[PDB]
Amino acid sequence: VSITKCSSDMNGYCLHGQCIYLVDMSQNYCRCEVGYTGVRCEHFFL
C-alpha cells in the first residue's frame, strides 16, 4: 500500500475517478468509478 494523490494541472486523463500516484511504479494511477465500461473512466455503459 504505497500511493499518493495528485496536484493541479494533473487531472487530464481520468474524468470519473480519484487521482493517485504509484511509488513502486512512478506513474499516474487514476481509479475509475466501479461501473464504467473502460479502464479510463470516460464513457458510462450503464
PDB file of all heavy atoms in Angstrom, residues 1-40:
ATOM      1  N   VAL A   1       0.854  -1.225   0.000  1.00  0.00           N
ATOM      2  CA  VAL A   1       0.000   0.000   0.000  1.00  0.00           C
ATOM      3  C   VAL A   1       0.875   1.255   0.000  1.00  0.00           C
ATOM      4  O   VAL A   1       1.161   1.825   1.034  1.00  0.00           O
ATOM      5  CB  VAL A   1      -0.814  -0.083   1.291  1.00  0.00           C
ATOM      6  CG1 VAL A   1       0.129  -0.027   2.494  1.00  0.00           C
ATOM      7  CG2 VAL A   1      -1.789   1.096   1.352  1.00  0.00           C
ATOM      8  N   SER A   2       1.299   1.693  -1.153  1.00  0.00           N
ATOM      9  CA  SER A   2       2.154   2.912  -1.218  1.00  0.00           C
ATOM     10  C   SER A   2       1.741   3.781  -2.409  1.00  0.00           C
ATOM     11  O   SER A   2       2.246   3.631  -3.505  1.00  0.00           O
ATOM     12  CB  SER A   2       3.576   2.389  -1.398  1.00  0.00           C
ATOM     13  OG  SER A   2       3.687   1.752  -2.664  1.00  0.00           O
ATOM     14  N   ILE A   3       0.826   4.687  -2.202  1.00  0.00           N
ATOM     15  CA  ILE A   3       0.373   5.565  -3.319  1.00  0.00           C
ATOM     16  C   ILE A   3       0.140   6.991  -2.805  1.00  0.00           C
ATOM     17  O   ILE A   3       0.148   7.239  -1.615  1.00  0.00           O
ATOM     18  CB  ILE A   3      -0.928   4.923  -3.814  1.00  0.00           C
ATOM     19  CG1 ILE A   3      -1.151   5.307  -5.277  1.00  0.00           C
ATOM     20  CG2 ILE A   3      -2.114   5.401  -2.971  1.00  0.00           C
ATOM     21  CD1 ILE A   3      -2.216   4.396  -5.890  1.00  0.00           C
ATOM     22  N   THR A   4      -0.057   7.928  -3.691  1.00  0.00           N
ATOM     23  CA  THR A   4      -0.278   9.336  -3.247  1.00  0.00           C
ATOM     24  C   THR A   4      -1.340  10.011  -4.120  1.00  0.00           C
ATOM     25  O   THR A   4      -1.713   9.508  -5.160  1.00  0.00           O
ATOM     26  CB  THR A   4       1.076  10.017  -3.434  1.00  0.00           C
ATOM     27  OG1 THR A   4       2.109   9.144  -2.998  1.00  0.00           O
ATOM     28  CG2 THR A   4       1.119  11.311  -2.619  1.00  0.00           C
ATOM     29  N   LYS A   5      -1.827  11.148  -3.706  1.00  0.00           N
ATOM     30  CA  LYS A   5      -2.861  11.857  -4.513  1.00  0.00           C
ATOM     31  C   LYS A   5      -2.199  12.635  -5.653  1.00  0.00           C
ATOM     32  O   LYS A   5      -1.021  12.490  -5.914  1.00  0.00           O
ATOM     33  CB  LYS A   5      -3.541  12.813  -3.532  1.00  0.00           C
ATOM     34  CG  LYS A   5      -5.030  12.917  -3.868  1.00  0.00           C
ATOM     35  CD  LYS A   5      -5.833  12.033  -2.911  1.00  0.00           C
ATOM     36  CE  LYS A   5      -7.208  12.659  -2.670  1.00  0.00           C
ATOM     37  NZ  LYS A   5      -8.101  11.512  -2.341  1.00  0.00           N
ATOM     38  N   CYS A   6      -2.946  13.460  -6.335  1.00  0.00           N
ATOM     39  CA  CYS A   6      -2.357  14.246  -7.458  1.00  0.00           C
ATOM     40  C   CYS A   6      -2.410  15.744  -7.142  1.00  0.00           C
ATOM     41  O   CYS A   6      -2.994  16.161  -6.162  1.00  0.00           O
ATOM     42  CB  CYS A   6      -3.231  13.923  -8.669  1.00  0.00           C
ATOM     43  SG  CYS A   6      -2.958  12.205  -9.168  1.00  0.00           S
ATOM     44  N   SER A   7      -1.799  16.554  -7.964  1.00  0.00           N
ATOM     45  CA  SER A   7      -1.813  18.024  -7.711  1.00  0.00           C
ATOM     46  C   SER A   7      -2.663  18.738  -8.767  1.00  0.00           C
ATOM     47  O   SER A   7      -3.595  18.178  -9.308  1.00  0.00           O
ATOM     48  CB  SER A   7      -0.351  18.457  -7.818  1.00  0.00           C
ATOM     49  OG  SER A   7      -0.144  19.614  -7.019  1.00  0.00           O
ATOM     50  N   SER A   8      -2.348  19.969  -9.059  1.00  0.00           N
ATOM     51  CA  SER A   8      -3.138  20.720 -10.079  1.00  0.00           C
ATOM     52  C   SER A   8      -2.620  20.411 -11.486  1.00  0.00           C
ATOM     53  O   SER A   8      -1.613  19.754 -11.657  1.00  0.00           O
ATOM     54  CB  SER A   8      -2.920  22.194  -9.740  1.00  0.00           C
ATOM     55  OG  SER A   8      -3.722  22.541  -8.619  1.00  0.00           O
ATOM     56  N   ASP A   9      -3.303  20.881 -12.494  1.00  0.00           N
ATOM     57  CA  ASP A   9      -2.851  20.615 -13.890  1.00  0.00           C
ATOM     58  C   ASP A   9      -2.462  19.143 -14.050  1.00  0.00           C
ATOM     59  O   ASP A   9      -1.677  18.787 -14.905  1.00  0.00           O
ATOM     60  CB  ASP A   9      -1.632  21.517 -14.091  1.00  0.00           C
ATOM     61  CG  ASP A   9      -1.800  22.322 -15.380  1.00  0.00           C
ATOM     62  OD1 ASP A   9      -2.758  23.073 -15.466  1.00  0.00           O
ATOM     63  OD2 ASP A   9      -0.966  22.176 -16.260  1.00  0.00           O
ATOM     64  N   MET A  10      -3.008  18.283 -13.233  1.00  0.00           N
ATOM     65  CA  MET A  10      -2.669  16.836 -13.339  1.00  0.00           C
ATOM     66  C   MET A  10      -3.937  16.012 -13.589  1.00  0.00           C
ATOM     67  O   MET A  10      -3.894  14.801 -13.671  1.00  0.00           O
ATOM     68  CB  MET A  10      -2.050  16.474 -11.989  1.00  0.00           C
ATOM     69  CG  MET A  10      -0.963  15.417 -12.193  1.00  0.00           C
ATOM     70  SD  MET A  10       0.531  15.907 -11.295  1.00  0.00           S
ATOM     71  CE  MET A  10       1.729  15.384 -12.546  1.00  0.00           C
ATOM     72  N   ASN A  11      -5.062  16.661 -13.712  1.00  0.00           N
ATOM     73  CA  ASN A  11      -6.329  15.914 -13.957  1.00  0.00           C
ATOM     74  C   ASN A  11      -6.740  16.043 -15.427  1.00  0.00           C
ATOM     75  O   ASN A  11      -7.636  16.789 -15.768  1.00  0.00           O
ATOM     76  CB  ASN A  11      -7.365  16.578 -13.051  1.00  0.00           C
ATOM     77  CG  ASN A  11      -7.520  15.760 -11.767  1.00  0.00           C
ATOM     78  OD1 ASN A  11      -7.556  16.310 -10.684  1.00  0.00           O
ATOM     79  ND2 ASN A  11      -7.613  14.460 -11.843  1.00  0.00           N
ATOM     80  N   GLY A  12      -6.090  15.322 -16.300  1.00  0.00           N
ATOM     81  CA  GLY A  12      -6.444  15.405 -17.745  1.00  0.00           C
ATOM     82  C   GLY A  12      -6.514  13.997 -18.338  1.00  0.00           C
ATOM     83  O   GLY A  12      -6.290  13.796 -19.515  1.00  0.00           O
ATOM     84  N   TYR A  13      -6.825  13.018 -17.532  1.00  0.00           N
ATOM     85  CA  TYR A  13      -6.911  11.623 -18.052  1.00  0.00           C
ATOM     86  C   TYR A  13      -8.162  10.931 -17.506  1.00  0.00           C
ATOM     87  O   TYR A  13      -9.027  10.514 -18.250  1.00  0.00           O
ATOM     88  CB  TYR A  13      -5.648  10.930 -17.540  1.00  0.00           C
ATOM     89  CG  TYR A  13      -5.788   9.437 -17.719  1.00  0.00           C
ATOM     90  CD1 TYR A  13      -5.764   8.880 -19.005  1.00  0.00           C
ATOM     91  CD2 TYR A  13      -5.942   8.608 -16.601  1.00  0.00           C
ATOM     92  CE1 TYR A  13      -5.892   7.495 -19.171  1.00  0.00           C
ATOM     93  CE2 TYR A  13      -6.072   7.224 -16.767  1.00  0.00           C
ATOM     94  CZ  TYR A  13      -6.047   6.668 -18.052  1.00  0.00           C
ATOM     95  OH  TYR A  13      -6.175   5.304 -18.216  1.00  0.00           O
ATOM     96  N   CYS A  14      -8.263  10.805 -16.211  1.00  0.00           N
ATOM     97  CA  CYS A  14      -9.459  10.139 -15.619  1.00  0.00           C
ATOM     98  C   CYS A  14     -10.539  11.177 -15.305  1.00  0.00           C
ATOM     99  O   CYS A  14     -10.327  12.096 -14.537  1.00  0.00           O
ATOM    100  CB  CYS A  14      -8.953   9.482 -14.335  1.00  0.00           C
ATOM    101  SG  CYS A  14      -8.255  10.748 -13.244  1.00  0.00           S
ATOM    102  N   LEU A  15     -11.695  11.041 -15.893  1.00  0.00           N
ATOM    103  CA  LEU A  15     -12.788  12.022 -15.626  1.00  0.00           C
ATOM    104  C   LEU A  15     -13.641  11.564 -14.440  1.00  0.00           C
ATOM    105  O   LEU A  15     -14.026  12.351 -13.599  1.00  0.00           O
ATOM    106  CB  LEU A  15     -13.633  12.046 -16.905  1.00  0.00           C
ATOM    107  CG  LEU A  15     -12.748  12.301 -18.129  1.00  0.00           C
ATOM    108  CD1 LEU A  15     -13.617  12.794 -19.287  1.00  0.00           C
ATOM    109  CD2 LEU A  15     -11.693  13.362 -17.801  1.00  0.00           C
ATOM    110  N   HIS A  16     -13.947  10.297 -14.371  1.00  0.00           N
ATOM    111  CA  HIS A  16     -14.788   9.790 -13.245  1.00  0.00           C
ATOM    112  C   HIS A  16     -13.972   8.840 -12.365  1.00  0.00           C
ATOM    113  O   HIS A  16     -14.005   7.638 -12.534  1.00  0.00           O
ATOM    114  CB  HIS A  16     -15.943   9.042 -13.922  1.00  0.00           C
ATOM    115  CG  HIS A  16     -16.429   9.843 -15.099  1.00  0.00           C
ATOM    116  ND1 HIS A  16     -15.768   9.833 -16.314  1.00  0.00           N
ATOM    117  CD2 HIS A  16     -17.488  10.704 -15.255  1.00  0.00           C
ATOM    118  CE1 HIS A  16     -16.422  10.663 -17.142  1.00  0.00           C
ATOM    119  NE2 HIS A  16     -17.482  11.220 -16.547  1.00  0.00           N
ATOM    120  N   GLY A  17     -13.238   9.373 -11.428  1.00  0.00           N
ATOM    121  CA  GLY A  17     -12.420   8.500 -10.540  1.00  0.00           C
ATOM    122  C   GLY A  17     -11.510   9.368  -9.667  1.00  0.00           C
ATOM    123  O   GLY A  17     -11.495  10.577  -9.778  1.00  0.00           O
ATOM    124  N   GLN A  18     -10.747   8.756  -8.801  1.00  0.00           N
ATOM    125  CA  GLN A  18      -9.836   9.545  -7.922  1.00  0.00           C
ATOM    126  C   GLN A  18      -8.410   9.518  -8.481  1.00  0.00           C
ATOM    127  O   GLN A  18      -7.945   8.508  -8.970  1.00  0.00           O
ATOM    128  CB  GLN A  18      -9.896   8.847  -6.564  1.00  0.00           C
ATOM    129  CG  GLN A  18     -11.314   8.954  -5.998  1.00  0.00           C
ATOM    130  CD  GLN A  18     -11.616   7.723  -5.141  1.00  0.00           C
ATOM    131  OE1 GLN A  18     -12.705   7.186  -5.190  1.00  0.00           O
ATOM    132  NE2 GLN A  18     -10.691   7.250  -4.351  1.00  0.00           N
ATOM    133  N   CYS A  19      -7.715  10.621  -8.413  1.00  0.00           N
ATOM    134  CA  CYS A  19      -6.321  10.658  -8.944  1.00  0.00           C
ATOM    135  C   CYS A  19      -5.335  10.168  -7.880  1.00  0.00           C
ATOM    136  O   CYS A  19      -5.401  10.556  -6.731  1.00  0.00           O
ATOM    137  CB  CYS A  19      -6.064  12.129  -9.275  1.00  0.00           C
ATOM    138  SG  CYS A  19      -5.357  12.257 -10.937  1.00  0.00           S
ATOM    139  N   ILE A  20      -4.419   9.317  -8.254  1.00  0.00           N
ATOM    140  CA  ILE A  20      -3.426   8.800  -7.262  1.00  0.00           C
ATOM    141  C   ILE A  20      -2.038   8.728  -7.915  1.00  0.00           C
ATOM    142  O   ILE A  20      -1.850   9.159  -9.036  1.00  0.00           O
ATOM    143  CB  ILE A  20      -3.903   7.393  -6.858  1.00  0.00           C
ATOM    144  CG1 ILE A  20      -5.405   7.211  -7.145  1.00  0.00           C
ATOM    145  CG2 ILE A  20      -3.653   7.190  -5.361  1.00  0.00           C
ATOM    146  CD1 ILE A  20      -6.227   8.103  -6.210  1.00  0.00           C
ATOM    147  N   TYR A  21      -1.061   8.190  -7.229  1.00  0.00           N
ATOM    148  CA  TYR A  21       0.304   8.104  -7.824  1.00  0.00           C
ATOM    149  C   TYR A  21       1.045   6.873  -7.292  1.00  0.00           C
ATOM    150  O   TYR A  21       1.206   6.701  -6.100  1.00  0.00           O
ATOM    151  CB  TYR A  21       1.009   9.387  -7.380  1.00  0.00           C
ATOM    152  CG  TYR A  21       2.493   9.259  -7.628  1.00  0.00           C
ATOM    153  CD1 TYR A  21       3.057   9.797  -8.791  1.00  0.00           C
ATOM    154  CD2 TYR A  21       3.305   8.604  -6.694  1.00  0.00           C
ATOM    155  CE1 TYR A  21       4.434   9.679  -9.020  1.00  0.00           C
ATOM    156  CE2 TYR A  21       4.681   8.486  -6.923  1.00  0.00           C
ATOM    157  CZ  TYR A  21       5.245   9.023  -8.087  1.00  0.00           C
ATOM    158  OH  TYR A  21       6.601   8.906  -8.313  1.00  0.00           O
ATOM    159  N   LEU A  22       1.495   6.014  -8.167  1.00  0.00           N
ATOM    160  CA  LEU A  22       2.221   4.790  -7.715  1.00  0.00           C
ATOM    161  C   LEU A  22       3.677   5.116  -7.363  1.00  0.00           C
ATOM    162  O   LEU A  22       4.377   5.762  -8.117  1.00  0.00           O
ATOM    163  CB  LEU A  22       2.173   3.850  -8.916  1.00  0.00           C
ATOM    164  CG  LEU A  22       0.794   3.220  -9.017  1.00  0.00           C
ATOM    165  CD1 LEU A  22       0.800   2.182 -10.138  1.00  0.00           C
ATOM    166  CD2 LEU A  22       0.439   2.551  -7.691  1.00  0.00           C
ATOM    167  N   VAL A  23       4.141   4.662  -6.228  1.00  0.00           N
ATOM    168  CA  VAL A  23       5.556   4.933  -5.843  1.00  0.00           C
ATOM    169  C   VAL A  23       6.461   3.811  -6.361  1.00  0.00           C
ATOM    170  O   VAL A  23       7.594   4.038  -6.735  1.00  0.00           O
ATOM    171  CB  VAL A  23       5.562   4.972  -4.316  1.00  0.00           C
ATOM    172  CG1 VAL A  23       5.340   3.564  -3.769  1.00  0.00           C
ATOM    173  CG2 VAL A  23       6.914   5.499  -3.832  1.00  0.00           C
ATOM    174  N   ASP A  24       5.961   2.603  -6.407  1.00  0.00           N
ATOM    175  CA  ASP A  24       6.790   1.477  -6.925  1.00  0.00           C
ATOM    176  C   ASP A  24       6.802   1.544  -8.452  1.00  0.00           C
ATOM    177  O   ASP A  24       7.683   1.026  -9.109  1.00  0.00           O
ATOM    178  CB  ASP A  24       6.088   0.208  -6.442  1.00  0.00           C
ATOM    179  CG  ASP A  24       4.670   0.162  -7.011  1.00  0.00           C
ATOM    180  OD1 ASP A  24       3.793   0.765  -6.414  1.00  0.00           O
ATOM    181  OD2 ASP A  24       4.484  -0.474  -8.036  1.00  0.00           O
ATOM    182  N   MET A  25       5.830   2.212  -9.008  1.00  0.00           N
ATOM    183  CA  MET A  25       5.757   2.370 -10.483  1.00  0.00           C
ATOM    184  C   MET A  25       5.475   3.841 -10.785  1.00  0.00           C
ATOM    185  O   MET A  25       4.462   4.183 -11.359  1.00  0.00           O
ATOM    186  CB  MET A  25       4.590   1.487 -10.928  1.00  0.00           C
ATOM    187  CG  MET A  25       4.973   0.741 -12.206  1.00  0.00           C
ATOM    188  SD  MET A  25       5.808  -0.807 -11.772  1.00  0.00           S
ATOM    189  CE  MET A  25       6.399  -1.218 -13.433  1.00  0.00           C
ATOM    190  N   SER A  26       6.364   4.704 -10.359  1.00  0.00           N
ATOM    191  CA  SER A  26       6.186   6.175 -10.562  1.00  0.00           C
ATOM    192  C   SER A  26       5.373   6.475 -11.822  1.00  0.00           C
ATOM    193  O   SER A  26       5.907   6.645 -12.900  1.00  0.00           O
ATOM    194  CB  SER A  26       7.602   6.730 -10.692  1.00  0.00           C
ATOM    195  OG  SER A  26       8.385   5.844 -11.481  1.00  0.00           O
ATOM    196  N   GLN A  27       4.080   6.546 -11.679  1.00  0.00           N
ATOM    197  CA  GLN A  27       3.205   6.842 -12.845  1.00  0.00           C
ATOM    198  C   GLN A  27       1.850   7.356 -12.348  1.00  0.00           C
ATOM    199  O   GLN A  27       1.556   7.313 -11.169  1.00  0.00           O
ATOM    200  CB  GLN A  27       3.054   5.509 -13.588  1.00  0.00           C
ATOM    201  CG  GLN A  27       1.999   4.641 -12.898  1.00  0.00           C
ATOM    202  CD  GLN A  27       2.413   3.171 -12.980  1.00  0.00           C
ATOM    203  OE1 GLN A  27       3.585   2.862 -13.076  1.00  0.00           O
ATOM    204  NE2 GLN A  27       1.495   2.243 -12.949  1.00  0.00           N
ATOM    205  N   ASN A  28       1.028   7.844 -13.233  1.00  0.00           N
ATOM    206  CA  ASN A  28      -0.300   8.364 -12.801  1.00  0.00           C
ATOM    207  C   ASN A  28      -1.294   7.214 -12.622  1.00  0.00           C
ATOM    208  O   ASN A  28      -1.642   6.527 -13.561  1.00  0.00           O
ATOM    209  CB  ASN A  28      -0.751   9.292 -13.930  1.00  0.00           C
ATOM    210  CG  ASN A  28      -1.682  10.366 -13.366  1.00  0.00           C
ATOM    211  OD1 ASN A  28      -1.815  11.431 -13.935  1.00  0.00           O
ATOM    212  ND2 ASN A  28      -2.338  10.130 -12.262  1.00  0.00           N
ATOM    213  N   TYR A  29      -1.758   7.008 -11.421  1.00  0.00           N
ATOM    214  CA  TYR A  29      -2.735   5.911 -11.173  1.00  0.00           C
ATOM    215  C   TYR A  29      -4.106   6.510 -10.860  1.00  0.00           C
ATOM    216  O   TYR A  29      -4.343   7.011  -9.780  1.00  0.00           O
ATOM    217  CB  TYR A  29      -2.180   5.159  -9.961  1.00  0.00           C
ATOM    218  CG  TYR A  29      -3.031   3.942  -9.676  1.00  0.00           C
ATOM    219  CD1 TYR A  29      -2.482   2.664  -9.813  1.00  0.00           C
ATOM    220  CD2 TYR A  29      -4.367   4.090  -9.272  1.00  0.00           C
ATOM    221  CE1 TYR A  29      -3.264   1.532  -9.549  1.00  0.00           C
ATOM    222  CE2 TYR A  29      -5.147   2.959  -9.009  1.00  0.00           C
ATOM    223  CZ  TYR A  29      -4.596   1.680  -9.148  1.00  0.00           C
ATOM    224  OH  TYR A  29      -5.367   0.564  -8.889  1.00  0.00           O
ATOM    225  N   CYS A  30      -5.008   6.473 -11.799  1.00  0.00           N
ATOM    226  CA  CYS A  30      -6.359   7.049 -11.552  1.00  0.00           C
ATOM    227  C   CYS A  30      -7.399   5.933 -11.419  1.00  0.00           C
ATOM    228  O   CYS A  30      -7.678   5.218 -12.359  1.00  0.00           O
ATOM    229  CB  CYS A  30      -6.655   7.908 -12.782  1.00  0.00           C
ATOM    230  SG  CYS A  30      -5.639   9.406 -12.730  1.00  0.00           S
ATOM    231  N   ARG A  31      -7.980   5.786 -10.259  1.00  0.00           N
ATOM    232  CA  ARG A  31      -9.009   4.721 -10.078  1.00  0.00           C
ATOM    233  C   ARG A  31     -10.341   5.198 -10.659  1.00  0.00           C
ATOM    234  O   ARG A  31     -10.879   6.208 -10.250  1.00  0.00           O
ATOM    235  CB  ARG A  31      -9.124   4.518  -8.565  1.00  0.00           C
ATOM    236  CG  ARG A  31     -10.414   3.760  -8.248  1.00  0.00           C
ATOM    237  CD  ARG A  31     -10.453   2.459  -9.053  1.00  0.00           C
ATOM    238  NE  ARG A  31      -9.401   1.602  -8.444  1.00  0.00           N
ATOM    239  CZ  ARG A  31      -9.737   0.567  -7.723  1.00  0.00           C
ATOM    240  NH1 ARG A  31     -10.155   0.734  -6.498  1.00  0.00           N
ATOM    241  NH2 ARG A  31      -9.655  -0.634  -8.228  1.00  0.00           N
ATOM    242  N   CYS A  32     -10.874   4.489 -11.615  1.00  0.00           N
ATOM    243  CA  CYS A  32     -12.167   4.920 -12.223  1.00  0.00           C
ATOM    244  C   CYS A  32     -13.339   4.532 -11.318  1.00  0.00           C
ATOM    245  O   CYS A  32     -13.177   3.831 -10.340  1.00  0.00           O
ATOM    246  CB  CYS A  32     -12.252   4.180 -13.559  1.00  0.00           C
ATOM    247  SG  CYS A  32     -10.946   4.778 -14.662  1.00  0.00           S
ATOM    248  N   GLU A  33     -14.518   4.987 -11.640  1.00  0.00           N
ATOM    249  CA  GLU A  33     -15.702   4.651 -10.800  1.00  0.00           C
ATOM    250  C   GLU A  33     -16.194   3.241 -11.128  1.00  0.00           C
ATOM    251  O   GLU A  33     -16.543   2.939 -12.252  1.00  0.00           O
ATOM    252  CB  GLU A  33     -16.759   5.693 -11.176  1.00  0.00           C
ATOM    253  CG  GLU A  33     -18.143   5.205 -10.745  1.00  0.00           C
ATOM    254  CD  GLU A  33     -19.152   6.349 -10.870  1.00  0.00           C
ATOM    255  OE1 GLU A  33     -19.661   6.549 -11.961  1.00  0.00           O
ATOM    256  OE2 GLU A  33     -19.399   7.005  -9.872  1.00  0.00           O
ATOM    257  N   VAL A  34     -16.226   2.374 -10.154  1.00  0.00           N
ATOM    258  CA  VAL A  34     -16.700   0.985 -10.412  1.00  0.00           C
ATOM    259  C   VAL A  34     -18.069   1.024 -11.096  1.00  0.00           C
ATOM    260  O   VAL A  34     -19.077   1.295 -10.474  1.00  0.00           O
ATOM    261  CB  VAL A  34     -16.802   0.333  -9.032  1.00  0.00           C
ATOM    262  CG1 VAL A  34     -17.140  -1.149  -9.191  1.00  0.00           C
ATOM    263  CG2 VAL A  34     -15.465   0.470  -8.300  1.00  0.00           C
ATOM    264  N   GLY A  35     -18.112   0.758 -12.372  1.00  0.00           N
ATOM    265  CA  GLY A  35     -19.415   0.784 -13.094  1.00  0.00           C
ATOM    266  C   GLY A  35     -19.204   1.314 -14.516  1.00  0.00           C
ATOM    267  O   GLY A  35     -20.084   1.241 -15.350  1.00  0.00           O
ATOM    268  N   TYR A  36     -18.045   1.845 -14.800  1.00  0.00           N
ATOM    269  CA  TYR A  36     -17.784   2.374 -16.170  1.00  0.00           C
ATOM    270  C   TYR A  36     -17.455   1.219 -17.118  1.00  0.00           C
ATOM    271  O   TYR A  36     -17.302   0.090 -16.696  1.00  0.00           O
ATOM    272  CB  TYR A  36     -16.586   3.312 -16.009  1.00  0.00           C
ATOM    273  CG  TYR A  36     -17.054   4.741 -16.148  1.00  0.00           C
ATOM    274  CD1 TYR A  36     -17.482   5.454 -15.020  1.00  0.00           C
ATOM    275  CD2 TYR A  36     -17.070   5.349 -17.408  1.00  0.00           C
ATOM    276  CE1 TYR A  36     -17.926   6.774 -15.155  1.00  0.00           C
ATOM    277  CE2 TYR A  36     -17.515   6.668 -17.542  1.00  0.00           C
ATOM    278  CZ  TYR A  36     -17.943   7.381 -16.415  1.00  0.00           C
ATOM    279  OH  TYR A  36     -18.383   8.681 -16.551  1.00  0.00           O
ATOM    280  N   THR A  37     -17.353   1.478 -18.394  1.00  0.00           N
ATOM    281  CA  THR A  37     -17.049   0.360 -19.342  1.00  0.00           C
ATOM    282  C   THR A  37     -15.667   0.538 -19.978  1.00  0.00           C
ATOM    283  O   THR A  37     -15.436   0.137 -21.100  1.00  0.00           O
ATOM    284  CB  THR A  37     -18.147   0.404 -20.412  1.00  0.00           C
ATOM    285  OG1 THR A  37     -17.679  -0.228 -21.594  1.00  0.00           O
ATOM    286  CG2 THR A  37     -18.530   1.852 -20.724  1.00  0.00           C
ATOM    287  N   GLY A  38     -14.742   1.121 -19.269  1.00  0.00           N
ATOM    288  CA  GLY A  38     -13.381   1.307 -19.846  1.00  0.00           C
ATOM    289  C   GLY A  38     -12.371   1.546 -18.723  1.00  0.00           C
ATOM    290  O   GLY A  38     -12.714   2.007 -17.653  1.00  0.00           O
ATOM    291  N   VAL A  39     -11.122   1.245 -18.963  1.00  0.00           N
ATOM    292  CA  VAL A  39     -10.084   1.469 -17.915  1.00  0.00           C
ATOM    293  C   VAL A  39      -9.582   2.911 -17.994  1.00  0.00           C
ATOM    294  O   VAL A  39      -8.399   3.176 -17.924  1.00  0.00           O
ATOM    295  CB  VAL A  39      -8.960   0.488 -18.256  1.00  0.00           C
ATOM    296  CG1 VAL A  39      -8.262   0.939 -19.540  1.00  0.00           C
ATOM    297  CG2 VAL A  39      -7.946   0.457 -17.110  1.00  0.00           C
ATOM    298  N   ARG A  40     -10.481   3.842 -18.153  1.00  0.00           N
ATOM    299  CA  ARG A  40     -10.077   5.270 -18.253  1.00  0.00           C
ATOM    300  C   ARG A  40     -11.254   6.172 -17.855  1.00  0.00           C
ATOM    301  O   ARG A  40     -11.293   7.341 -18.180  1.00  0.00           O
ATOM    302  CB  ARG A  40      -9.701   5.448 -19.725  1.00  0.00           C
ATOM    303  CG  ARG A  40      -9.330   6.909 -20.002  1.00  0.00           C
ATOM    304  CD  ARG A  40     -10.140   7.457 -21.184  1.00  0.00           C
ATOM    305  NE  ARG A  40     -11.490   6.829 -21.092  1.00  0.00           N
ATOM    306  CZ  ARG A  40     -12.103   6.447 -22.181  1.00  0.00           C
ATOM    307  NH1 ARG A  40     -12.526   7.337 -23.037  1.00  0.00           N
ATOM    308  NH2 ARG A  40     -12.290   5.177 -22.414  1.00  0.00           N
TER     309      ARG A  40
END
